[PDB]
Design a protein around this ligand. Structure first.
Ligand SMILES: [Mn+2]
Ligand SMILES: [Mn+2]
Length: 257
DNA sequence: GTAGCGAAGCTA
């Protein structure tokens, strides 16, 4: 049995109490975090060490930042993407935990299809695909998860017409998501729930979470051996309902052997 | 238009 959760916390300093409650109540075996918004030396290591968790992270000031938090020691820690060696943005960290290769991603948002950040998103996803492909040659059990900033299909967008060829939802971005699936990865939530709206992000503005209008952009992609053991996938909207919340909801997958 | 950072604007 193994339980893994991914959560885009949007500032770990603000959300640390809620991270700690996730780790105390029905804890996962592994928790991965995105958008830490704290530098490498500002990570709350001692507070999570006190509770019995190992932590590896890659941080920077103000933006981005990723961490992996586990009961087991995370081994063979890799930082960033080999095909993009000079990118200073801290968006990828990988480790092997209990025989499972975990690749935690805070994928580029892109801002808008005509933004320069959209070309960056394109290049970055190209580099991610090459890295994942190489990692998959060595690890039969592999999980690629985090904030992809891509809603894969119309059922992952509350208003397909208004988001037509817009950021997160464009046919170009969806092809990049498909490029990752084509390596042999399964969209774990859609294996357990082929139908229905399972949004993971709701805009802070316009009370979108109360309206329950959001996108499914946080995913857990699994290798075949992990899909064969997949038991359930759930979006934790209760964490999203808390006071001063992250705009993303945690997503957890459970496997059995 | 909100949220977080960091101190005005950028990013999401
Ligand atoms: Mn459409
Ligand atoms: Mn944000």
């Amino acid at each position: 049995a193994m339980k893994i959760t991914t959560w885009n916390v949007n500032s770990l300093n603000v959300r640390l109490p809620q991270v700690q409650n996730l780790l105390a109540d029905n804890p996962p075996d592994i928790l991965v975090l995105q958008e830490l918004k704290l530098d490498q030396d500002k990570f709350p290591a001692a507070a999570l060490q006190m509770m019995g968790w190992h932590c590896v992270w890659s941080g920077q000031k103000t933006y981005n930042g990723v961490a992996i938090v586990s009961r087991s020691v995370p081994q063979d820690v890799h930082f960033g993407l080999p095909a993009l060696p000079d990118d200073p943005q801290r968006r990828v960290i990988a480790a092997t935990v209990s025989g499972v290769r975990v690749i935690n991603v805070y994928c580029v948002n892109g801002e808008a299809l005509d933004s320069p950040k959209f070309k960056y998103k394109e290049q970055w996803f190209a580099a991610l695909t090459e890295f994942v492909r190489d990692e998959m040659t060595r690890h039969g059990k592999l999980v690629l998860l985090g904030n992809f900033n891509i809603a894969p299909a119309d059922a992952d967008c509350y208003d397909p017409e208004k988001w037509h060829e817009k950021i997160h939802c464009s046919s170009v971005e969806r092809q990049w998501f498909q490029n990752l699936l084509d390596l042999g990865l399964t969209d774990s939530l859609r294996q357990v729930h082929p139908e229905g709206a399972f949004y993971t992000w709701f805009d802070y503005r316009g009370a979108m979470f109360q309206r329950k209008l959001g996108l499914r952009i946080d995913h857990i992609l699994v290798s075949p051996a992990m899909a064969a053991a997949l038991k359930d996938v759930r979006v934790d909207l209760e964490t999203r309902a808390l006071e001063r919340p992250s705009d993303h909801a945690p997503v957890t997958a459970e496997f059995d052997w």
